[PDB]
Each structure stands twice: as structure tokens, then as C-alpha cells.
TrEMBL record, chain B:
It comes from the Eukaryota. It comes from Perkinsus marinus (strain ATCC 50983 / TXsc). Keywords: Membrane, Transmembrane, Transmembrane helix. The keyword Transmembrane helix applies. This is Uncharacterized protein. The keyword Transmembrane helix applies. The chain crosses the membrane at residues 13-34.
UniProtKB/TrEMBL annotation, chain C:
This is Uncharacterized protein. It comes from the Eukaryota.
TrEMBL record, chain F:
This is Ubiquitin, putative. It comes from Perkinsus marinus (strain ATCC 50983 / TXsc). The chain crosses the membrane at residues 42-62.
From TrEMBL, chain H:
This is Merozoite surface protein, putative. The lineage of its organism: Eukaryota, Sar, Alveolata, Perkinsozoa, Perkinsea. The keyword tRNA-binding does not apply. Disulfide bonds join C113-C120. It comes from the Eukaryota. Keywords: Merozoite. It comes from Perkinsus marinus (strain ATCC 50983 / TXsc). The chain holds residues 22 to 173 of 547 of the full protein.
């Protein structure tokens, strides 16, 4: 009593539909976050941060000059061939 | 306008054949009692035990498998001379601090 | 239809075994004299009797199959025929739409998930300690 | 009813469009019909693989 | 006068002659319910084989009210 | 084949385009278009991708989630 | 096997019958140019191949 | 901003900048965009056939940009493809009965290198250059050339 | 033209040491997807080290 | 002791007690190549766990010889010593799940 003034078709259609949505997002958003469905720019998951924290761009090791590692103790060649030194046509700095 | 094949021949014989293949395979598995549970892992028991020790913290992280065997080949002896797990862990720790 | 068939999809010459249904039987009818009544004995064979243009229906079929090649307007076929004419074209176009708006989105999601969790979202996480993405079609494992 | 040159006036809106819009519409119409299609007409007529098979064959009397 | 749009007219019938084409009794015009039952079973087997991975390895222990020779003891 | 009637029951003409006035809603127009051009091509074209996608993505629950709680010899923790 | 085109041929319903075979036999045929001739050639083939008793032995073997 | 049109009309006008929508909603405009030789056969087309053709054509041309985007990403991926571990030479790996010469039966360039083994050929070309024999390729840094798809 | 334009460029580093790769698997194997511009710059510097032109080129900052 | 003890424990035991008989996993086929490769892999895994000197691993080599011709074993045993045998790479340095 005294709420009937509010109760109305438009006030009801936006109350059932809108409320149904309020629960659809409140219950689905955590699942999307867990399954990496949310956009990365909007938010990064903890799993995303854990993997990204392991990435760096300063490793300059492991350069080899052969297609195969044929075992042994010597390993693949690691020294640039003499005939290849100074064979690059690099534009002047 | 006269038809030679089934009106929906392409979908019929494509999806239909796939269905018969799948159903026949299930029947074959039942008759031979084949285990149907998919395992994506290797079954080397000693190895899986070493992996649990790493997950439990008994073996330090990023320790190579050749650092744990009782026989090493020549190439793994070469690697052991340059292996420093402690340094590797410190480097990873530094990266995490920088990221956060 | 794409493939040419002499009997049904004869577009090279446009030959049709029977006349149009629009024509009255008194004007033109399919060449079928299988129901001809027995010939009286006092009748005498004048023509060859050989199946050919001496028969009125066959003659009219040949004549029409040549004079039908010029017409004032198009004989609009119904929508059922038009759909069948380009059935493959339309189906391939819808296949392209499916590949862009159905296959595309979930394939992208799988790769992004793989980036973080090492394996696709539809695979069993391994514990063997091997590294890499692994299989993609899980039902063929 | 006023008839405009083909491809020059839109039927989607009562407003013909602004200067930039009109320039784009008019000039694309010109480019397609009198510049781009020069290549297609040249390939279709001057370099027909089927016309070349009948080159040097007498006329059909 | 009255006319019919040709695009919505019905397909013309085959001519009735000594050589008449008839597809009515073939039942090959479209996929039937049986085909869709095959698709449903395929989906079912696919889901079942994955959901219940111990079905192919059943238990030999059986009680069976009314013994083994009663009809409900075979399914 | 078997001669059959045209199954399109929608509106045969919207009238002359006059700046997009007196025309159906967009979704109604999309539905009428597919009715006019045939749903068989839509179902046929999308069927292959729908099947492949449903099977692959179904593994998210059938192969991954379920499996996490499938191994009967995993729930048991050691030293407990 | 009837010898008069007026006498119809019995056909079962299904995907391999006399009616099913008639619909497809002349699809690629340049010789079946009218109903009378088409039916004559159709019955000629049916008489020769399907009313031949020994032919059924090979059907079993295949 | 023009207020002489509705918002929907404005959007459709701009999508009609090339006249695509106008040709769809006007048969006369579509036939008068055909070159005269082919316009001769236009009167026979049904409206079903015309709009279906435009639909197939429009769907194709509107997906070409998407394929172009997918192809550019592919080129960038290949342009910066991550290094992979050097293959250990297993029991049945790198078996050779004779040198690789099927590409150059008489010249026999890079007999030891495989047909598309770019790093082996580069070092082999360097030997030939050091021997006063010119060979083409493998000299410009990737980031200093156009169309490399390896620039930051 | 595709072939010629590619042949001029130095070869990309297809392979690295087997051991060093697995000691930094995550960075190398996944670096591209997480940040492609920095991964591209890192690759360029490695090419400059593998072919001995590092002191002759200035690699643009990312 | 039990009559079915051989089948119990492993399928491997059957040929371990009867070295010159068919292995249950390969008796259906005359070609025994796959049998040789399994036996060699088992010798490789034994040494990693127990060492070369262990009598068990020495017998796992005798079992491998029973089905593997000498020319194959010598080649595969050299690859193993170098560290290039694909049947002996430690599991954490395998590439089978990478790039696909
Ligand atoms: C593995 C790799 C597989 C690769 C497949 C490659 C397919 C390439 C062609 C695809 C294509 O364009 O097909 C659409 C197109 C559809 O035809 P349509 O006339 O528009 O169809 C209208 C309706 O579909 C309704 O049509 P309809 O049912 O009324 O019938 C008309 C149509 C019906 O047919 C088709 O439409 C064919 C569709 C094939 C799809 C394949 C996928 O007829 C034909 O087109 C007949 C073509 C000639 C067939 C000749 C067969 C020769 C071999 C026979 C066996 C000999 C050995 C026997 C040994 C054993 C003895 C006991 O097919 C063709 O026109 C191509 C026909 C020739 C294909 C030859 C392929 C090799 C055999
Ligand atoms: C509360 C709920 C809780 C959950 C409950 C879950 C319950 C299960 C849910 C799943 C659903 C189960 C459904 C069961 C019953 C289904 C009944 C049904 O409707 O099926 C029929 C339905 C459609 O069949 P239809 O009725 O015969 O089609 C009607 C047509 O409209 C008839 O018209 P039409 O035949 O005239 O059609 C047009 C036709 C017209 O065509 C012609 O005229 C004939 C032409 C033939 C010759 C063609 C020539 C060659 C092609 C030339 C063009 C090439 C273009 C492309 C080039 C590509 C280049 C790379 O054109 C075509 O179709 C072909 C041409 C179009 C382009 C083809 C493109 C290539 C295709 C081949 C490759 C396909 C694989 C691609 C893979 C990816 C890429 C590698 O099929 C399916 O739905 C598929 C099977 C479904 C059942 C199995 C599902 C298994 C997995 C279920 C997992 C679900 C999740 C479980 C979760 C559990 C959690 C606990
Ligand atoms: C073979 C070319 C393949 C190119 C693939 C490229 C892929 C990437 C996306 C391209 C998107 C455009 C559409 C491509 C699909 C095909 C279009 C088509 O069929 O045109 C037919 C159209 C007329 O054909 P028609 O046979 O005479 O008539 C057929 C129909 O009856 C009547 O046709 P309609 O009137 O119904 O038109 C169909 C409609 C269907 O297309 C669409 O509606 C698709 C909309 C996609 C939107 C994507 C966003 O297409 C158009 O409206 C095309 C308009 C093209 C206007 C070009 C005017 C000249 C531009 C010159 C630019 C110069 C830049 C210099 C920069 C210098 C910097 C220093 O053809 C042309 O006008 C020729 C050009 C075709 C398009 C070329 C696109 C090249 C894009 C280059 C971008 C460069 C960016 C540089 C940035 C630099 C930053 C620093
Ligand atoms: C995101 C990456 C991809 C981006 C690129 C995507 C490329 C594909 C884009 C295709 C657009 C095609 C436009 C056609 C031209 C329309 C012209 C027009 O205004 O028409 C007005 C006309 C006006 O109607 P009318 O006047 O023609 O009416 C004809 C006469 N009667 C009334 C008898 C029917 O109506 C239409 O719009 C008709 C065309 C509707 C076509 C709808 C096609 C949808 C394509 C996308 C599929 C999405 C699938 C998603 C997954 C589904 C899973 C099941
Ligand atoms: C009251 C009822 C309300 C109902 C509302 C329903 C809303 C439904 C919304 C669905 C949104 C779906 C979004 C999908 C986004 C996918 C983006 C994506 O992956 O883009 C990249 C991807 C390709 O990526 P690559 O880098 O090449 O990697 C994969 C191949 N190697 O591109 C594509 O897949 C292109 C296609 C994008 C399709 C986007 C689909 C959007 C659908 C919106 C539907 C809205 C419905 C609203 C209904 C309202 C009813 C009242
Ligand atoms: C390959 C050989 C195929 C032979 C069988 C098919 C021949 C065929 O149809 O060719 C003709 C056909 C169309 O000619 P019409 O005048 O319409 O028909 C001929 C008379 N009715 O021609 C073509 O297919 C055009 C060929 C053009 C490209 C030729 C390229 C040759 C490449 C050789 C590489 C070595
Ligand atoms: C006509 C066909 C022309 C084919 C020309 C291209 C041939 C080609 O690319 O062959 C190389 C390709 C890939 O081999 P690798 O270079 O070792 O792969 C290493 C990848 N970095 O395959 C071959 O070598 C086989 C070539 C067979 C002969 C091809 C010409 C006929
Ligand atoms: C060369 C290789 C080709 C590809 C592989 C071929 C595989 C074999 C051939 C398959 C061809 C199928 C084509 C499609 C035909 C089609 O859809 O055919 C469709 C028909 C129905 O015809 P309609 O469309 O007219 O209804 O399907 C049926 O007849 C079955 C109806 C549904 C039955 C449901 C229950 C089935 C139970 C099965 C139990 C099996 C137990 C087995 C124990 C050992
Ligand atoms: C080219 C012309 C071809 C003509 C057709 C040739 C068909 C030949 C079939 C011969 C079959 C004989 C063996 C039967 C199985 C047997 O004894 O097999 C013996 C075994 C074991 O019997 P016991 O254990 O009791 O000793 O039987 C079974 O375990 C069950 C057998 C079921 C057989 C069903 C499948 C075959 C059905 C055949 C129907 C048509 C028969 C026609 C006969 C002329």
C-alpha cells in the first residue's frame, strides 16, 4: 500500500528485466574473469600477471651457427666464421 | 529439372558418416573393455614423483631433469658445468619485483 | 545447376523432350502414340512408318525446340529454381560468415587462454612437466 | 520528378551531403567510370584470349 | 485483368507420358527423422563417452531383483 | 525432384525507398531476407562450423573441468 | 517383360526401383530425345540387364 | 552537423558514399552503373537475382579487409618468429646419401646446405664472396629494409 | 618481387642453443604474444650480435 | 608364486621371465620393431633411475638384445651416449608439445 503509484508496466519491465540482468552480470562476471574472457586492457588476471612477470627482453645467450646439436661435449659451433665477419651492408649510423 | 542424388546428399553423407564412425567406435571400445579416460601425461612413475617433489618444494624450482638422474649423457655433462639453479631463481625473483 | 546433363540440365542446346504445359493438347502435346488404336486392315501404309518427323508430335517438337530460341521477354522462373541455381554460392557465403563470427571468436579466446595457462581452455592441464601448448583437438586424443 | 546524373546524388537521405561528402561521391563515380575502368576495358577488348584464336582466320561468309 | 507474380508460382509438374518421372515414392527429397535421430545419438555418444569414462569398464557385481532370468535384468 | 510451392510467406514488396520511411524493423528485414533467399543455405553453411566449434568448446567442461574431478585417485592427498 | 509401351511397368517405392532407375538412366543420354524413344530405350536396357537370370549371380558376388 | 536529416539517414548516407546502398535500392541506378555493353542484358534480370548478386558481391568485398587484417598479422608473426631450440640429431634425423644439388645441377651452389636453409646459405655465400665470387642476398639488416615486417 | 625483397634481408635466427632456450622458456616462447614490439627489438639486437654489426647499427628504442 | 603373477604387477614381467617368447603387447604382429623400441626405452629409463652398474639395468639391456639386432643397438647406443637419442631425452627438455 502506497507503492502502487510506482508499480507500472514500464516500472515493472525495467524491474524484472533489469533485475534479471543485475544477477546475470553479478554471477557471470567472476566466471569470465577466471576464464580469461574479459578484455586485457580493462583488467589483468592474477594468472596473467604471474606469467607476464616471468618475461624479459635482455637474454643474449645461446647464439649458435649450426642447424643441429650433434651431442658430445663440444656442442654446436658458437664462434662466427671468419669469412662472415664484416659481410653486412649496414647503412651509416 | 531432374534430381540424381539425395536432396541433402552433401550434409547427409558427411555428418551421417561421422556419426556412424563415432558410434561404431564406442561399440568397439565396449566390446574390448578399453579404458576411455584420457590421460595427457607421461606414465614414467619415478619422473612424476620427482615432479611432485618440485611442486612440494622438496626439489628447487627450475632444477633440470638431468640434475636429478643417476646417469648423465655427454651433452648433459656439458650442461651441468654451466648450470646454476640458484642464480636462475634469483633472476626470476628480480623480474617479479620489477613487474610489480 | 552447374554440371551439364543432356537429359535435365541441357543448357548448351536447350533441347526439351516435351512441349510446354501451357500449350493446349490441340496445339501441341508430348510425342506419345503408344495408345493408338489398332489400324483397320483396309488401311494401307503410305509413309515409312519409321519413328521420325512424319509423326506430327515429333515434328512439332523439333520445330518448337528451334523457334523457342527467340522470345520477346524472359520466362521468369519461380524462387525455388533461383535458389537452386546458386545454392552452393549462398552456402559458401554463409560458411564464410560462420568462419569469421563463430570460428574466429573462440579460436582467439583459446589462444589468449593458452598464453596464460600454457594449454588451451578445452584441454587437460598436464603434470608431467613437459612444456608447450600441446594438442588442440581434444576429442582426437 | 527531377532526375540527377547517375551515381551523383544519394537516395538514402533528403540532404545531399556536405562539401567533402559530395566531393567524395562525385569523384569516386568519375574514377570508377572513366579512370579505373580504362584498365578493364583495355584488357577485355585489346587482350582477349579468344579473339586471338581467330586472328588470321578468314571471315565467315 | 488479374495476374500472378511469376516468382511465387508453383513448380511445374513432370509431363505425364509413357516416360514419366516420379520422385514422390522415393523419399530421398530431404533428410528424415531417422537422420536426425542419428545426429542426436552421435551427440549423445560424444557427450556420454566423455562424461562417464568408466562405463566401458563396468562392475561385474550384480544383484538383480527377481533373479537374472527376469526381463528387467537384461537392461 | 518433387515439384513444390514457394514457401516464402513474408511481404513481397516494401514499396519504393523514400529516405527509409515506412519500412519494417531491421531485424524483421533480416528475417524476411533469409526467408526470401532460403534458410537451407544458412543451416547448411553454418552447420560445419557449429559442429566443430561445439565439439572443441565442449571440452572446456567435458575434458577440462570434469576431468579435474574425474581422476578417482587424485582427491586422496598424501600424508593425510 | 511387356512388349507394348502402353502396358506400364510395375515399380516399388524406394531408392532402387524401376521408377528411380528411369529418372536417372537418361540424365546423360543424347539418344532419349522424346517420350516414345526414351521409354523404348529404357525398357530395352531393363530387359537386357535386369531380366537376365545369370546377371543376378554377379550381384551376389559383388 | 546537418540537422536536415535524421540520425539514421545520416549514417546510411555516409555508408552510401560509394553508392552501394543506392544501387541496392534503385534498379535504374544499378543498371546505369553498368558499362553500356552489359546494360543491354540487364532488362532480363529478376530483382531476386539482382539483389542476391549484390549481396554475394557485398559480403565478399566487405570480408576482404578482414582477410587483409588476418594476413598482415600473419606476416608480422613470421617477421618476428621466436627462436626455437637447436634440434638434437636423433637416430633418424639429418640423414644424407648425397649432397643437395637438384636446384643447381651444374653450378652446385651450397651443396651442403638444404634448399631453404637460409642461415647455412648465408655463411656459404660469405665463403664464396671471400673467394672473389659474388652471390646475392643475406647482407642487409632486416630493420633497415622495407616490407620486412620486423620493425618495432 | 616477394622472393627478391626477402632474399636481400639477413636470415632471422631460426634456432638458438637447446639448453639456453629451456632455461628461459617462458620469456622466449611467450615473449612475442605478451609484447611484440619489445620482442621485435630484442630479436634485432640478437641478430646484430650474431652477425657482428652491433657497433655499426643504432637499434631504435622501443 | 601365484600362477598369474607374471601378468600381475606389469605386462613387462612376462618376457622378463621368458625372454625368448612373444610379448603380450606385440604378439599379434610378426613385425617386432615396435617391441625393440619399447625394450630400448625401458633400458634407457632404468639407467636414469638406477645407474648402469645395477644388475636390473644390465638385464634390461639383455632383454633389449633379445629383440633388437646388434647393428641397430650400436647406432642407438651411440646416440644415447652423445645425448641425442630421442627415446632418452629427459622429459622436461622434450619439444613434443611445442608449436603444436
Ligand atoms: C578427397 C578429396 C575430394 C575432393 C572433391 C573435389 C570436388 C570438386 C568439385 C566440386 C564442385 O564444384 O561440386 C559442386 C558441383 C555441383 O553440381 P551441380 O550440378 O551444381 O549440383 C546440383 C545439385 O547439387 C543437385 O545435383 P543432382 O544431384 O541433381 O546431380 C547433378 C550432379 C550431381 O553430382 C554432383 O553434384 C557431384 C558433387 C560432388 C561433391 C564432392 C565433395 O551431377 C554431376 O555434377 C555429375 C558429375 C560427374 C560425376 C562423374 C563420376 C565419375 C566416377 C564414377 C565412378 C567410377 C568408378 C566406379 C568403381 C566401382 C564400380 C562398382 O559439382 C559439379 O558440378 C562437379 C561434378 C564433377 C566432380 C568430379 C569429382 C571427381 C569424381
Ligand atoms: C539445457 C541444455 C544443456 C546442454 C545440452 C547439450 C545437448 C547437445 C548439444 C549439441 C547439439 C546436438 C544436436 C543433435 C541433433 C542434431 C540434429 C540436426 O539438426 O543435425 C543436422 C545439422 C544440419 O544437417 P542438415 O539438416 O542435413 O542440414 C540442412 C541443410 O539446410 C540442407 O540444405 P542443403 O543440403 O541444400 O545445404 C546447403 C548445401 C548446398 O550444397 C550443395 O548444393 C551441395 C554441394 C556439395 C559439393 C560441394 C563442392 C565443394 C565445395 C566448394 C566450396 C568450398 C568453399 C569453402 C572453401 C574452403 C577453403 C579452405 O551446402 C553445404 O552444406 C556445403 C557447401 C557450403 C560450404 C562448405 C564448406 C566446407 C565444408 C566441409 C568441411 C567441414 C569441416 C570444416 C572444419 C573447419 C575448417 C577446416 O547438422 C548438425 O547439427 C551437425 C551434427 C550435430 C550432432 C553432433 C554433435 C556432436 C557434438 C555435440 C557437443 C555439444 C556440447 C555438449 C556439452 C555437454 C556438457 C555436459
Ligand atoms: C583488387 C584490389 C584488392 C585490394 C585489397 C585490399 C584489402 C584491404 C582493404 C581494402 C578496402 C577497400 C575495398 C577492397 C575490396 C574490393 C573493392 C571493390 O570491389 O572495388 C570495386 C571498385 C569498382 O569496381 P568496378 O569493376 O568498376 O565495379 C564493380 C561494381 O559493379 C561496382 O562496385 P561498387 O561501387 O559497388 O564498389 C564495391 C565496394 C565494395 O567494397 C566495400 O564496400 C568494402 C568496404 C571495406 C571497408 C574497410 C574499412 O568497393 C568500393 O566501394 C571500393 C572503393 C575504392 C575506391 C578507391 C579510390 C582510389 C583510392 C586511391 C588511394 C591512393 C592512396 C595513396 C596514398 C599515398 C601515401 C603517400 O574498384 C575500384 O574502385 C578499384 C579499387 C578497389 C579497391 C582497392 C583498395 C586498396 C586499398 C589500399 C589502402 C592503402 C592504404 C595506405 C595507407 C598509408 C598510410 C600512411
Ligand atoms: C568482424 C570481422 C568481419 C567483418 C566483415 C564481415 C563481412 C560480412 C558482412 C556482410 C554484410 C552483407 C550486406 C548485404 C547488403 C545489405 C543491403 C541492404 O541494406 O539491404 C536492405 C534490405 C532491404 O530489403 P529488400 O528491399 O531487399 O527486400 C527484398 C524483398 N522482400 C521484402 C520480398 C524480401 O534488407 C536487408 O538488409 C537484406 C539483407 C540481409 C542480409 C543479412 C546478412 C547477415 C550477414 C552476417 C551474418 C552473421 C552471422 C553470425 C553468426 C550466426 C550464427 C547462426
Ligand atoms: C535483452 C537481451 C540482451 C542480449 C545481449 C547479448 C549480447 C551478446 C554479445 C556477444 C559478444 C561477442 C563478442 C565476441 C568478440 C570476439 C573478438 C575477437 O576475438 O576478435 C578477434 C577475432 C580474430 O582474432 P585473431 O587475432 O585473428 O585470433 C583468432 C584467429 N587466430 O575476430 C573475430 O573473431 C571477428 C568476429 C568478431 C565477432 C564479434 C561478435 C559480436 C556479437 C555481438 C552480439 C550482440 C547481440 C545483442 C542482442 C540484444 C538482444 C536484445
Ligand atoms: C590441359 C588440357 C585440357 C584438355 C581438356 C579440356 C579442354 C578445354 O575445355 O579447353 C577449352 C577451353 C575453352 O575453350 P572453348 O572455345 O570454350 O572450348 C573449346 C571448343 N568447345 O579453354 C580453356 O580452358 C582455356 C585455357 C587457357 C589457359 C591455357 C594454359 C596452358 C598452360 C600449360 C602449362 C604447361
Ligand atoms: C613446381 C614446384 C616448385 C617448388 C619450388 C619450391 C621448392 C621448395 O621450397 O622446396 C623446399 C621444401 C622444404 O625443404 P627444406 O628447405 O629442407 O625445409 C626447411 C625449411 N626452412 O621441400 C623440399 O626441399 C622438397 C623439394 C622437392 C622439389 C620441388 C620442385 C619440383
Ligand atoms: C569410405 C569411407 C566413407 C566414410 C565412412 C563410412 C562409414 C560407414 C557408412 C556410413 C554412411 C552413413 C551415411 C548417412 C546415412 C543416414 O544418415 O541415413 C539416415 C537414415 C534414416 O533415413 P531418413 O533420413 O529417411 O530418416 O538413418 C537410419 O537409417 C538410422 C536412423 C536412426 C537410428 C538411431 C539408432 C541407431 C542405433 C545404432 C546402434 C549400433 C550398434 C553397433 C554395435 C556393433
Ligand atoms: C557368391 C555367392 C555367395 C553366396 C553366399 C555365401 C554365404 C556363405 C556363408 C556361410 C557361413 C557358414 C558359417 C556360419 C558360421 C559358423 O559356422 O560359425 C561357427 C561359430 C561357432 O560355432 P560352435 O561354437 O557352435 O562350434 O558360430 C558362432 O559362433 C556364431 C555364428 C553366427 C553367424 C552369423 C553370421 C553369418 C550368417 C550367414 C547367413 C547366410 C548363410 C548362407 C549359407 C549358404
Amino acid at each position: 500500500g502506497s507503492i502502487e503509484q510506482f508499480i507500472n508496466l514500464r516500472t515493472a519491465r525495467m524491474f524484472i528485466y533489469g533485475g534479471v540482468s543485475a544477477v546475470f552480470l553479478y554471477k557471470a562476471t567472476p566466471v569470465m574473469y577466471r576464464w580469461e574472457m574479459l578484455p586485457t586492457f580493462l583488467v589483468k588476471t592474477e594468472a596473467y600477471k604471474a606469467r607476464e612477470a616471468m618475461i624479459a627482453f635482455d637474454n643474449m645467450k645461446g647464439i649458435v651457427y649450426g642447424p643441429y646439436d650433434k651431442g658430445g661435449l663440444e656442442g654446436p659451433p658458437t664462434k662466427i666464421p671468419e669469412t662472415s665477419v664484416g659481410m653486412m651492408k649496414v647503412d651509416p649510423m | 529439372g531432374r534430381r540424381l542424388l539425395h536432396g541433402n546428399y552433401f550434409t547427409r553423407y558427411l555428418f551421417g558418416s561421422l556419426a556412424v564412425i563415432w558410434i561404431a567406435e564406442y561399440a568397439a571400445a565396449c566390446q574390448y573393455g578399453i579404458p576411455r579416460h584420457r590421460n595427457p601425461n607421461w606414465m614414467w612413475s619415478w619422473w612424476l614423483e620427482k615432479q611432485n617433489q618440485i611442486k612440494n618444494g622438496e626439489i628447487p624450482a627450475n632444477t633440470p631433469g638431468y640434475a636429478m638422474v643417476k646417469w648423465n649423457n655427454e651433452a648433459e655433462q656439458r650442461w651441468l658445468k654451466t648450470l646454476n639453479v640458484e642464480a636462475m631463481n634469483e633472476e626470476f625473483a628480480r623480474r617479479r619485483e620489477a613487474y610489480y | 545447376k552447374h554440371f551439364f546433363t543432356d537429359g535435365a540440365n541441357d543448357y548448351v542446346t536447350g533441347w526439351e523432350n516435351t512441349p510446354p504445359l501451357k500449350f493446349p493438347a490441340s496445339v501441341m502435346k508430348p510425342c506419345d502414340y503408344s495408345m493408338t488404336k489398332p489400324i483397320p486392315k483396309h488401311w494401307k501404309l503410305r509413309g515409312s512408318g519409321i519413328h521420325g518427323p512424319e509423326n506430327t508430335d515429333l515434328m512439332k517438337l523439333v520445330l518448337w525446340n528451334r523457334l523457342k530460341q527467340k522470345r520477346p521477354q524472359r520466362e521468369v522462373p519461380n524462387i525455388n529454381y533461383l535458389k537452386d541455381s546458386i545454392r552452393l554460392e549462398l552456402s559458401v557465403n554463409w560458411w564464410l560468415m560462420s568462419c569469421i563470427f563463430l570460428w574466429g571468436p573462440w579460436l582467439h579466446w583459446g589462444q589468449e587462454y593458452q598464453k596464460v595457462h600454457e594449454q588451451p581452455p578445452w584441454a587437460m592441464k598436464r603434470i608431467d612437466g613437459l612444456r608447450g601448448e600441446g594438442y588442440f583437438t581434444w576429442f582426437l586424443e | 520528378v527531377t532526375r540527377y546524373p547517375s551515381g551523383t546524388r544519394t537516395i538514402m537521405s533528403p540532404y545531399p551531403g556536405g562539401p567533402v561528402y559530395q566531393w567524395l561521391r562525385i569523384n569516386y563515380n568519375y574514377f570508377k567510370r572513366y579512370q579505373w575502368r580504362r584498365v578493364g576495358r583495355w584488357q577485355m577488348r585489346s587482350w582477349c584470349y579468344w579473339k586471338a584464336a581467330f586472328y588470321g582466320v578468314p571471315e565467315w561468309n | 485483368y488479374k495476374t500472378e507474380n511469376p516468382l511465387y508460382k508453383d513448380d511445374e509438374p513432370f509431363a505425364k507420358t509413357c516416360h514419366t518421372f516420379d520422385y514422390t515414392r522415393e523419399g530421398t527429397e530431404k533428410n528424415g527423422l531417422g537422420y536426425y535421430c542419428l545426429m542426436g545419438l552421435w551427440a549423445s555418444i560424444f557427450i556420454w563417452d566423455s562424461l562417464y569414462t568408466g562405463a566401458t569398464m563396468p562392475t561385474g557385481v550384480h544383484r538383480y531383483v527377481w533373479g537374472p532370468y527376469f526381463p528387467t535384468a537384461w537392461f | 525432384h518433387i515439384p513444390h510451392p514457394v514457401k516464402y510467406v513474408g511481404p513481397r514488396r516494401y514499396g519504393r525507398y523514400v529516405y527509409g520511411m515506412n519500412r519494417p524493423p531491421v531485424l524483421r528485414q533480416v528475417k524476411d531476407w533469409i526467408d526470401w533467399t532460403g534458410w537451407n543455405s544458412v543451416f547448411g553453411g553454418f552447420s560445419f562450423q557449429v559442429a566443430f566449434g561445439l565439439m572443441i568448446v565442449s571440452g572446456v567442461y567435458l575434458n577440462n573441468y570434469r576431468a579435474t574431478h574425474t581422476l578417482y585417485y587424485t582427491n586422496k592427498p598424501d600424508n593425510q | 517383360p511387356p512388349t507394348r509401351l502402353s502396358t506400364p511397368l510395375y515399380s516399388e517405392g524406394g531408392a532402387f526401383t524401376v521408377n528411380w532407375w528411369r529418372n536417372r538412366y537418361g540424365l546423360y543420354s543424347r539418344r532419349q530425345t522424346d517420350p516414345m524413344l526414351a521409354e523404348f530405350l529404357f525398357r530395352q536396357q531393363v530387359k537386357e540387364w535386369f531380366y537376365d537370370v545369370p546377371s543376378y549371380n554377379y550381384a551376389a558376388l559383388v | 552537423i546537418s540537422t536536415s536529416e535524421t540520425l539514421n539517414q545520416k549514417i546510411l548516407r555516409w555508408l552510401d558514399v560509394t553508392g552501394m546502398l543506392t544501387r541496392w535500392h534503385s534498379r535504374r541506378e544499378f543498371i546505369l552503373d553498368m558499362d553500356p555493353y552489359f546494360r543491354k542484358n540487364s532488362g532480363m534480370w529478376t530483382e531476386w537475382e539482382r539483389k542476391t548478386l549484390l549481396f554475394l558481391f557485398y559480403c565478399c568485398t566487405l570480408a576482404t579487409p578482414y582477410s587483409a587484417y588476418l594476413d598482415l598479422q600473419e606476416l608480422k608473426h613470421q617477421g618476428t618468429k621466436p627462436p626455437r631450440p637447436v634440434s638434437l640429431e636423433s637416430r633418424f634425423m639429418n640423414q644424407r646419401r648425397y649432397d643437395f644439388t637438384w636446384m643447381h645441377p651444374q653450378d652446385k651452389f651450397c651443396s651442403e646446405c638444404r634448399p631453404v636453409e637460409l642461415e647455412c646459405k648465408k655463411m656459404c655465400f660469405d665463403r664464396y664472396r671471400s673467394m672473389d665470387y659474388r652471390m646475392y642476398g643475406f647482407q642487409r639488416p632486416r630493420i633497415q629494409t622495407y616490407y620486412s615486417f620486423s620493425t618495432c | 618481387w616477394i622472393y627478391v625483397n626477402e632474399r636481400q634481408r639477413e636470415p632471422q635466427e631460426n634456432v638458438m642453443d637447446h639448453e639456453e632456450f629451456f632455461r628461459d622458456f617462458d620469456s622466449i616462447y611467450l615473449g612475442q604474444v605478451f609484447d611484440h614490439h619489445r620482442f621485435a627489438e630484442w630479436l634485432a639486437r640478437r641478430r646484430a650480435v650474431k652477425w657482428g654489426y652491433a657497433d655499426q647499427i643504432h637499434i631504435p628504442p622501443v | 608364486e601365484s600362477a598369474d603373477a607374471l601378468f600381475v604387477g606389469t605386462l613387462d614381467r612376462l618376457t622378463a621371465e621368458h625372454p625368448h617368447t612373444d610379448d603380450p603387447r606385440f604378439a599379434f604382429q610378426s613385425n617386432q620393431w615396435n617391441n625393440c623400441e619399447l625394450r630400448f626405452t625401458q633400458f634407457c629409463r632404468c639407467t636414469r633411475e638406477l645407474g648402469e652398474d645395477d644388475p636390473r639395468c644390465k638385464y634390461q639391456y639383455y632383454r633389449a638384445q633379445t629383440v633388437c639386432h646388434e647393428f641397430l643397438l650400436e647406432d642407438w647406443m651411440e646416440h644415447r651416449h652423445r645425448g641425442t637419442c630421442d627415446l632418452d631425452i629427459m622429459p622436461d627438455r622434450q619439444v613434443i608439445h611445442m608449436r603444436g
